[PDB]
Design a protein around this ligand. Structure first.
Ligand code: SF4
Ligand code: SF4
Ligand code: SF4
Ligand SMILES: [Zn+2]
Lengths: 178, 145, 207, 114, 94, 48, 96, 125, 112, 379, 43
């Protein structure tokens, strides 16, 4: 069902009245004045601005930012070197090197990330069958060097032991949807 | 196969056996194919492995804590399609797709066992046989592997 | 009917087959391997010595009116003598349809252009010459468009690797921005994924 | 054997075009090292030119010769209609690269190349 | 808890140490070496050994979901315990 | 909190002068928000 | 909204329209956060019977194409498909 | 029109690679034998071109594995040894082949397992 | 009647049916040059015959258009001119001849 | 002839001038090429989407949708109704985003910079929606083959309604400034005047066509989704100037709400991802309890879902036009070629003809009309 | 039980429309007003 823009329903007239209105709008600039009035309107309104460090924008529990490995309530880790994160990471960012553990269990020795390559997608927390790795909400980890961003197992563990008071609730809310 | 299970019921498990310092045994995964049994009773002339029971309670493995060590123990790994009889050294170290399987031979003996050498980030992780219908025929030695 | 399957209709697989027979009997020359896909599309393979005839026909003849060259493309398959496969995806409005023309080519076997007819190709051909290595006659301006103005090679082939041969960096010793050979930091992991067990017993190939 | 030609029929016509192209580059270089405030000498430039020519002298096929000619002409257009810059043009001299040691012992002591 | 090497470097939870002769330990100078103090091995050893009567038992890892997939364990081997690969917990038969 | 303003500005925070051996009367980041509050502050929930 | 009646009137005379009715900002005209834990449906494929995959294979109903006029393997004027049915204007605002 | 030139084709110039990465690179044309772990035979159908390997060291910073050569991970497919050889000798490399290792046929007279005079008689079931 | 068409680059043609007779007659007069065993002739002959029948059976354009069911009269004229040129060109080319040179065998074989 | 260069103030132009008017404009593309179609071949069908988000970076979802539809035409399946409807919804939201950015960057490069700052608040609202649903602001991985990733949280529809209740007033308040200002009328009118035959030939698409009288919309024709159900009137222009194009974009902004209203008032219940667990991963509860679903999870997320050897050419009515995909495939998860078709390509091919005889400060308005985005172009 | 965020039996109607108003006055009015002011000034 098409339409027609920039076209009159028919040929116009040569009425002195229409010519008069045209001349007026060409001289006294009615439309320009209307634009000025609109700017005045928005001037006299409330601005949507906010103070960042003292007010922070809205979000939803499904954010994707700084990373965080996790733990069971019993202190133990959750990663078992299933390598799905490595085989699905579109960027090939992750680097893993696994091993046994003196107690017989299975665990890692190297779980490194390059947050310069990580596009912050979500595939790793989708694949991890144990919800170990969870891309988190923290987006303030800008730095001054390109070596505070090649995170490793211990930095991820610290970030988990730090933010776990928030990721628990976020997931407890989000998991059902998935 | 299919796309899901219609099994809303409970599963089973089974004790694990010590069989040697090479062949890590989990035995809640044996689909009971008998490859190990036949391979042993025919090739290695061992005659110690076998099935003990009837019904789901069936198991596969010696009735005692005996050790199945032999110059050819170390191919049941490649033969058991499942990860029940895994290799203890390689275990927990890596996965296949990561690897760059190169191809080589053995020197531990003067036979000429064609071999697949698996790499990982510039390092060896495991060794596999390679099918030569004359020399090694999909079987190689504990030593070389 | 089933929910998780599109309907394999008949109207299209019949109409486009009729049109294929039509074009075939019109151009018993400059044509070979016509075909219709299982998903309502028409492909027409042709010798490179008939490109412009075919395109003029399909643009002009009323019953086709394949006006808009929605796309021009290349593909590389190295297991054959004529390894490149040039592709034109064309669109007609009156008859509300699309079509696909193919023609084989090879490095050291240039092709006849179509700029006289579809001026869109004036740039797709530049792309092709820059990336793959396939050449086109009667083309006014043919130069590296995408890559650098000094780049050398043909990347979109299957041999020119992903990482490429050279990297860049600034070297205060001369103040310029020089190109040195690739010495990466991490290696491009190549995951072996192709699983053996055959899933499609219909597209098989016997010894 | 029985194949199709490109722009030519024999090494001789290929070579007449090649000579035209040599003339172009020879008559051009000065304009480059005068427009883009380079450092090298016109003689060094012409040396690079003749070297990039000589390093394709194991050729027989007119098709190969003609494709090389086409690419050279593209690059010459690029240069004289100034798009390549100081960097684009000095990317040839490997000016930040230790000459690959061909001394077998050099290769031995340094790396793994045979 | 963490221990230390001759040179004062905090041993990791997996025995990583830069011996006295390695030049890769300049990055630490005027800086620190990040390490976690909570060692999983001790934190799982501390945990109590669970007890049951049904010889076979199903483990998930805490929450119904949110933990390791349902794995079923046998416990008839009275010589010792029965561990769960994912979570590390260990059960015993009554 | 002031739930009569518009969105994003109905919550806010006044930081601490000194935080972990430091003088932060002027110097002020956005990472000084502990998580159990951070979550609400960023409008993820409604119960502190 | 916290602003004054006179300023409302002024901005409205300026613009031409009303604003207190179609503000851009958001004063509790949203859905509360902390929503309740939901429960979800499933597809028509979570049955227990008559769900044999062979029926709905999906990516095996495919079959290779049907070649025509290969190199080894009266009538009417036809087209690739029927023509385009011309369109008509709208019932709402065809002009502008 | 056409030409009479019986010279072997070489496009090493148009290719765009240096002398080092064209000459010292020994190419290998083989068929990837099965992964014994599996029992699958939709891999031993093609003919694959790979290159010899090269230096693959460890980064000092973290421990990654780097490379000086880009081609290490350039694996190419083909459906025929003749075509693969054509491509290889065309690009100018030095090719070495690994011919086909094909299984044998066998006669599995199952009933033999339950024989009387033979030695095949198994002691299991 | 009308003021324009609805496109850009076109015209308010005030002499229809006449240009149409002209162009179609000329198409057929060129086709005369074509061997009868050429499908292009064998088809476009009848196509243009039917178009002529239609223009002669409908004198008013506002119905001739929707009857042809093609584009608008000006588009029809343009397309007829294009078919004319196509004919003049297929006359120099010899397409109706047999095939030029068959390809190798493993060319149109997908997969590979 | 005063031939000069021209850049920002990516867009590297070389103008062959004559005095003050123009004689030629040669763009120099390639300042944003990376290797998308040289990387994909070394990847699966589920770690490729990001590429199609990064392409035509404004919308990103009318692009994920193209990729999904191509993969589905290959796999001979269909997604469910809730998925199709959600996907239409976000398609329209992206139409809005792209139209907004084109309009406002036009007016900004010209100098009028207020509507930019005005409409960006509503854009932030749309990004809040993208966040509530996907997780990230812009480059959501939401739309995926076999359907969609997650369902819709229980606080979205109301917000969408409350936003559509006001977007129309904002559009009108910007029209008041622009669609009658003689200054804009004179900056745009009689510029980029094009004729239908040359448009078709050069390969133009979408707006660059239907602003020249033509009637071509790949949603009315070649309907790829439920777009056959709902009503939406297509706008067209008779002259073929930047003014007509601008007005087309605004009218589409409006008809998009005319669509969203019905999408909302008819969105059915149901599933999101087709229950064929060999293609789309399953829910986590089953992934954890059952076994076959876990195996399929593992395979999907190491070896992408196999695809049979075929070939297609899809198409969309993205904000600009025939976003196309020639996706070739062997019987493997790793494809063999993924040729994008982005209209900017032909738009540039036609710039050298739309800018013959016009002055120097009209190239900018031409580009504004063309809504040039370079991610889609370089590839 | 099942809850997946559908709407109720109907939402309100939206304005997909142009409300661009007709505001102002007549040209004769404006011109004569300006000119009357002009004449007062002159006098
Ligand atoms: S979020 Fe995506 S890109 Fe980042 S580490 Fe996880 S899988 Fe890789
Ligand atoms: S997916 Fe999770 S459990 Fe598996 S390797 Fe990655 S982080 Fe570890
Ligand atoms: S080979 Fe493996 S699966 Fe087969 S019977 Fe032996 S243990 Fe069981
Ligand atoms: Zn457990």
């Amino acid at each position: 069902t098409y339409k027609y823009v920039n076209k009159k329903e028919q040929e116009s007239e040569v009425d002195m009245k229409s010519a008069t209105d045209n001349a007026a709008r060409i001289l006294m600039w009615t439309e320009l004045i209307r634009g000025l009035g609109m700017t005045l309107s928005y001037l006299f309104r409330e601005p949507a601005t906010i103070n960042y460090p003292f007010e922070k924008g809205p979000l939803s529990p499904r954010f994707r930012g700084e990373h965080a490995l996790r733990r069971y309530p019993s202190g133990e880790e959750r990663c078992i070197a299933c390598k799905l994160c490595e085989a699905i990471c579109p960027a090939q960012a992750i680097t893993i090197e696994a091993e046994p553990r003196a107690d017989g269990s299975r665990r890692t020795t190297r779980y490194d990330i390059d947050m310069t390559k990580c596009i912050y997608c979500g595939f790793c927390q989708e694949a991890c069958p144990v919800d170990a790795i969870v891309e988190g909400p923290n987006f303030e980890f800008s730095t001054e060097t390109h070596e505070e961003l090649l995170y490793n197992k211990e930095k991820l563990l610290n970030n988990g032991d730090k933010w776990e008071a928030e990721i628990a609730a976020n997931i407890q809310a989000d998991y059902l949807y998935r | 196969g299919s796309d899901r299970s219609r099994f809303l019921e409970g599963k089973r498990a089974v004790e694990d056996k010590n069989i040697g310092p090479l062949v890590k045994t989990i035995m809640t995964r044996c689909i009971q194919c008998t490859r190990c049994i036949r391979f042993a009773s025919e090739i290695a002339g061992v005659d110690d492995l076998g099935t003990t029971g009837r019904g789901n309670d069936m198991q596969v493995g010696t009735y005692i804590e005996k050790m199945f060590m032999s110059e050819l123990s170390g191919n049941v790994i490649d033969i058991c399609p499942v990860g029940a009889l895994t290799s203890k050294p390689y275990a927990f170290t890596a996965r296949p797709w990561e690897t760059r399987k190169t191809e080589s031979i053995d020197v531990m003996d003067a036979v000429g066992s064609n071999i697949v050498v698996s790499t990982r980030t510039g390092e060896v992780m495991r060794i596999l046989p390679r099918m030569h219908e004359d020399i090694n025929e999909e079987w190689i030695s504990d030593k070389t592997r | 009917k089933r929910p998780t399957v599109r309907p394999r209709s008949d109207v299209t697989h019949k109409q486009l087959s009729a049109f294929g027979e039509y074009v075939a009997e019109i151009l018993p020359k400059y044509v070979q391997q016509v075909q219709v896909s299982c998903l309502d599309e028409l492909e027409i393979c042709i010798h490179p010595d008939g490109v412009i005839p075919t395109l003029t026909f399909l643009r002009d003849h009323t019953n086709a009116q394949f006006k808009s060259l929605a796309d021009l493309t290349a593909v590389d398959v190295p297991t054959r003598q004529n390894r490149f496969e040039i592709v034109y995806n064309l669109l007609s409005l009156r008859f509300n349809s699309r079509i696909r023309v193919k023609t084989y080519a090879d490095e050291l076997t240039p092709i006849d252009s179509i700029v006289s007819v579809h001026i869109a190709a004036n740039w797709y051909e530049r792309e092709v010459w820059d990336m793959f290595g396939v050449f086109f006659f009667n083309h006014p301006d043919l130069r590296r468009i995408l890559t650098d103005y000094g780049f050398e090679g043909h990347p979109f082939r299957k041999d020119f690797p992903l990482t490429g041969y050279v990297e860049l960096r600034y070297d205060d010793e001369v103040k310029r921005v020089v190109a040195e050979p690739v010495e990466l930091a991490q290696e491009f992991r190549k995951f072996d994924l192709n699983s053996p067990w055959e899933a499609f017993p219909a597209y098989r190939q016997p010894p | 054997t029985s194949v199709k030609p490109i722009f030519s029929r024999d090494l001789n016509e290929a070579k007449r075009r090649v000579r035209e192209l040599y003339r172009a580059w020879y008559r051009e270089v000065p304009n480059t090292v005068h427009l883009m405030q380079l450092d090298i000498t016109v003689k060094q430039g012409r040396d690079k030119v003749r070297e990039m020519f000589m390093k394709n002298a194991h050729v027989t096929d007119p098709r190969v010769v003609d494709l090389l000619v086409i690419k050279g002409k593209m690059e010459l257009q690029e240069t004289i209609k100034v798009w390549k810059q100081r960097t684009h043009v000095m990317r040839f001299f490997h000016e930040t690269e230790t000459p690959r040691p061909k001394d077998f012992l050099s290769k031995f002591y340094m790396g793994h190349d045979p | 808890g963490v221990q230390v090497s001759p040179s004062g470097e905090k041993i990791t939870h997996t025995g990583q140490v830069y011996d006295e002769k390695d030049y890769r330990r300049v990055r630490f100078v005027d800086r620190q070496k990040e390490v976690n103090e909570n060692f999983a091995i001790d934190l799982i050893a501390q945990q109590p050994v669970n007890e049951v009567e049904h010889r076979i038992i199903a483990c998930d890892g805490g929450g119904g979901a949110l933990g390791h997939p349902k794995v079923y364990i046998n416990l008839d081997k009275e010589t010792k315990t029965g561990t769960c690969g994912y979570c590390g917990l260990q059960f015993k038969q009554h | 909190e002031d739930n009569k303003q518009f969105f994003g500005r109905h919550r806010w925070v006044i930081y601490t002068t000194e935080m972990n051996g430091k003088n932060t009367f002027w110097d002020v980041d956005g990472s000084m928000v502990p998580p159990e509050w951070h979550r609400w502050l960023h409008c993820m929930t409604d119960d502190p | 909204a916290s602003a004054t009646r006179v300023i409302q009137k002024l901005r409205n005379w300026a613009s031409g329209q009303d604003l207190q009715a179609k503000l851009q900002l958001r004063y509790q005209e949203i859905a509360k956060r902390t929503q309740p834990p939901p429960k979800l449906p499933v597809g028509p494929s979570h049955k227990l019977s008559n769900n044999y995959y062979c029926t709905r294979d999906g990516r095996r109903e495919v079959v290779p194409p049907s070649i025509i006029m290969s190199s080894q393997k009266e009538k009417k004027a036809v087209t690739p498909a029927p023509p385009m049915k011309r369109w008509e204007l709208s019932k709402d605002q065809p002009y502008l | 029109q056409l030409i009479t030139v019986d010279e072997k084709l070489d496009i090493t110039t148009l290719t765009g690679v240096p002398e080092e990465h064209i000459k010292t690179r020994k190419v290998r044309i083989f068929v990837p034998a099965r992964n014994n772990m599996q029992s699958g035979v939709n891999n031993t159908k093609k003919w694959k071109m790979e290159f010899d390997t090269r230096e693959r060291w460890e980064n000092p910073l973290m421990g990654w594995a780097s490379t000086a050569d880009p081609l290490s991970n350039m694996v190419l497919t083909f459906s025929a040894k003749e075509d693969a050889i054509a491509f290889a000798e065309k690009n100018g490399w030095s090719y070495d082949v690994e011919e086909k290792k094909v299984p044998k046929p066998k006669s599995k007279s199952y009933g033999a397992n339950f024989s009387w005079n033979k030695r095949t008689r198994v002691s299991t079931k | 009647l009308k003021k324009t068409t609805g496109l850009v680059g076109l015209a308010v043609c005030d002499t229809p049916h006449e240009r149409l007779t002209i162009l179609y007659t000329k198409t057929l007069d060129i086709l005369k040059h074509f061997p009868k065993h050429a499908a292009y002739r064998k088809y476009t002959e009848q196509i243009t015959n039917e178009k002529l029948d239609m223009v002669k059976a409908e004198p008013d354009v506002k119905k001739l258009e929707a009857l042809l069911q093609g584009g608008e009269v000006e588009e029809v004229i343009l397309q007829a001119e294009k078919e004319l040129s196509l004919a003049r060109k297929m006359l120099k080319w010899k397409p109706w001849e047999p095939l030029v040179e068959e390809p190798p065998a493993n060319q149109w074989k997908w997969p590979i | 002839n005063m031939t000069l260069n021209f850049g920002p103030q990516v867009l590297r132009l070389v103008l062959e001038l004559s005095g003050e008017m123009v004689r030629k404009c040669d763009p120099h593309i390639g300042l944003l090429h990376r290797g998308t179609e040289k990387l994909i071949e070394y990847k699966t069908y589920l770690q490729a989407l990001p590429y199609f988000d990064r392409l035509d970076y404004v919308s990103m979802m009318c692009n994920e949708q193209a990729y999904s539809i191509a993969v589905e035409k290959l796999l001979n399946i269909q997604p469910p109704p809730r998925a199709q409807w959600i996907r239409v919804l976000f398609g329209e939201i992206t139409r809005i985003l792209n139209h907004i950015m084109a309009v406002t960057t036009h007016a900004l490069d010209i100098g009028a910079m207020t509507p930019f700052f005005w409409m960006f608040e509503e854009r932030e609202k749309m990004f809040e929606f993208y966040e509530r649903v996907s997780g990230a602001r812009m480059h959501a991985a939401y739309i995926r083959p076999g359907g969609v990733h997650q369902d819709l949280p229980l606080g979205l529809l109301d917000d969408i309604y409350e936003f559509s209740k006001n977007f129309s007033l904002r559009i009108d308040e910007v029209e008041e400034m622009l669609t009658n200002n003689r200054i804009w009328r004179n900056r745009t009118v009689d510029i980029g005047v094009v004729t239908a035959e040359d448009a078709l030939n050069y390969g133009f698409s979408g707006v660059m066509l239907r602003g020249s009288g033509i009637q071509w919309d790949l949603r009315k024709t070649q309907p790829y989704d439920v777009y056959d159900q709902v009503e939406f009137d297509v706008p067209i222009g008779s002259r073929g100037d930047c003014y007509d194009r601008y007005l087309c974009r605004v009218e589409e902004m409006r008809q998009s709400l005319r669509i969203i209203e019905q999408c909302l008032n008819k969105m059915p219940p149901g599933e999101i991802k087709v229950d064929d667990a060999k293609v789309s991963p399953p829910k986590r509860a089953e992934m954890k309890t059952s076994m076959e679903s876990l195996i399929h999870h593992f395979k999907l997320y190491t070896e992408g879902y196999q695809v049979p050897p075929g070939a297609t050419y899809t198409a969309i009515e993205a904000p600009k036009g025939e976003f196309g995909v020639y996706l070739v495939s062997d019987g493997s998860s790793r494809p063999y070629r993924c040729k994008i078709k982005a209209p900017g390509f032909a738009h540039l091919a036609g710039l050298d003809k739309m800018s013959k005889g016009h002055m120097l400060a009209d190239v900018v308005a031409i580009i504004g009309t063309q809504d040039i985005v370079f991610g889609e172009i370089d590839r | 039980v099942k809850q997946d965020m559908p709407p109720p039996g109907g939402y309100g109607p939206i304005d997909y429309k142009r409300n661009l108003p007709r505001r102002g006055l007549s040209g004769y009015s404006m011109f004569a007003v300006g000119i009357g002011a002009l004449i007062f000034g002159y006098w």
